[PDB]
Design an enzyme around this catalytic site. Structure first.
Site, PDB file in Angstrom:
ATOM      1  N   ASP A   1      -5.283  -7.844  -1.649  1.00  0.00           N
ATOM      2  CA  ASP A   1      -5.708  -6.495  -2.032  1.00  0.00           C
ATOM      3  C   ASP A   1      -6.599  -5.902  -0.953  1.00  0.00           C
ATOM      4  O   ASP A   1      -7.805  -6.157  -0.913  1.00  0.00           O
ATOM      5  CB  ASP A   1      -6.433  -6.576  -3.383  1.00  0.00           C
ATOM      6  CG  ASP A   1      -6.780  -5.226  -3.954  1.00  0.00           C
ATOM      7  OD1 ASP A   1      -6.516  -4.189  -3.309  1.00  0.00           O
ATOM      8  OD2 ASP A   1      -7.335  -5.219  -5.064  1.00  0.00           O
ATOM      9  N   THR A   2      -5.994  -5.115  -0.066  1.00  0.00           N
ATOM     10  CA  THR A   2      -6.719  -4.470   1.014  1.00  0.00           C
ATOM     11  C   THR A   2      -7.667  -3.382   0.514  1.00  0.00           C
ATOM     12  O   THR A   2      -8.583  -2.983   1.238  1.00  0.00           O
ATOM     13  CB  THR A   2      -5.761  -3.880   2.071  1.00  0.00           C
ATOM     14  OG1 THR A   2      -4.899  -2.893   1.487  1.00  0.00           O
ATOM     15  CG2 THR A   2      -4.922  -4.996   2.726  1.00  0.00           C
ATOM     16  N   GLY A   3      -7.460  -2.913  -0.718  1.00  0.00           N
ATOM     17  CA  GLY A   3      -8.364  -1.953  -1.363  1.00  0.00           C
ATOM     18  C   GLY A   3      -9.572  -2.563  -2.060  1.00  0.00           C
ATOM     19  O   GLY A   3     -10.411  -1.849  -2.609  1.00  0.00           O
TER      20      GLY A   3
END
Ligand SMILES: COc1cccc(S(=O)(=O)N(Cc2cccs2)C[C@@H](O)[C@H](Cc2ccccc2)NC(=O)c2cccc(F)c2C)c1
EC number: 3.4.23.16
Lengths: 99, 99
Positions: free
Chosen positions: A25-27
């Site tokens: 999850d880059t967010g």
């Protein structure tokens, strides 16, 4: 590996001898796992997402193997809808976005 | 391009006359934008994350430009703290995770 995004980027992680599925999850700034037991001291902390804030337990310097790659870092434990690997560990395993 | 994850992966997008800054988010199934008065029909929807659910407006077939790459798809509009580019659009612009 290279991972495309037509499906959720879920991977197997190993933590404390246990296998779990977690989302890359880059967010997410932080790494947050569903309620589980981890050893050693933790500190209460709060994190915020789309729906507001939650309370979590912060464990520092925790080894997790993510898809064969070793990280050692901060793992938060609390009522996340899903296990997530965030940027703090994604960077340790050399993960980048590419297009 | 290649984007590292030391900081939030924020990039410029375009929707109508609005250039905006948005997060490339492999952990989001959907694209969620901060409140804005888009033309067209929409359907109400709920989406959940950390903290719980928010109400959004689903708009379909909305052209968006993400770092000079064209996409067109479903966009959710509601009181998110950050503009989120989700998997539905990340696939369209050829975006992968690599490590
Ligand atoms: C249909 O459901 C959705 C569609 C689009 C986005 C989302 S989302 O809630 O934003 N979310 C899905 C989740 C997966 C796992 C836990 S939360 C995407 C996730 O990347 C969101 C994106 C985001 C960033 C900043 C402010 C708000 C939201 N990130 C976080 O919740 C977050 C932020 C900071 C620390 C942290 F550990 C996390 C998990 C949900």
């Amino acid at each position: 590996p290279q991972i495309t995004l037509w499906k959720r980027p879920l991977v197997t992680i190993r933590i404390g001898g246990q296998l779990k599925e977690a989302l890359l999850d880059t967010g997410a700034d932080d790494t947050v796992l569903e309620e589980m037991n981890l050893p050693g001291k933790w500190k209460p902390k709060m994190i915020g997402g789309i729906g507001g804030f939650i309370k979590v337990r912060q464990y520092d310097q925790i080894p997790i193997e993510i898809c064969g790659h070793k990280a050692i870092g901060t793992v938060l434990v609390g009522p996340t809808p899903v296990n997530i690997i965030g940027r703090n560990l994604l960077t340790q395993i050399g993960c980048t976005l590419n297009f």
